[PDB]
Amino acid sequence: GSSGSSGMASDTPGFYMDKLNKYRQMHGVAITYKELSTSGPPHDRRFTFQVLIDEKEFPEAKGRSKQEARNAAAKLAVDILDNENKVDCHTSGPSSG
């Protein structure tokens, strides 16, 4: 099931997933793809997936197949990195000493 028909739409085999690695190497971070359970109807099953960079938890994503899922999850991740705008987790309280 492999053809060479590409024009308006691009069906690259894991486009985003490729952008991640290219970043994990340059920067030097650790990217991990956690395989989440399946969610959806009995007829149509959607496999969820998520990526983890620098011990960070990214917003998983749904996808027809493991691939479609992984690629999607990466979309949200790569979209963030480009901005690298992370939100502070631990709020420095009155702790002064």
Q: Round to whole Å and give the CA distance between 28 and 14.
A: 21
For residue 39, tell me if it sits in a domain.
Answer: yes
Stretch (H or E) spanning 77: helix 66-81
Q: Which residues contact 13 (CB under 8 A, 6 or more apart)?
A: 67
Closest listed residue to residue 31, CA positions, set 51, 8, 60? 51
Tokens of 92: 């420095």
For residue 93, tell me if it sits in a domain.
Answer: no
Report whether 48 contacts 36 (CB < 8 A): yes
Domain holding 65, by residue range, is 14-83
* Angle, in degrees to the nearest 10, between helices 15-23 and 66-81: 50
Single-letter code of the amino acid located at 26? M
For residue 35, tell me if it sits in a domain.
Answer: yes
Q: Which residues contact 85 (CB under 8 A, 6 or more apart)?
A: none
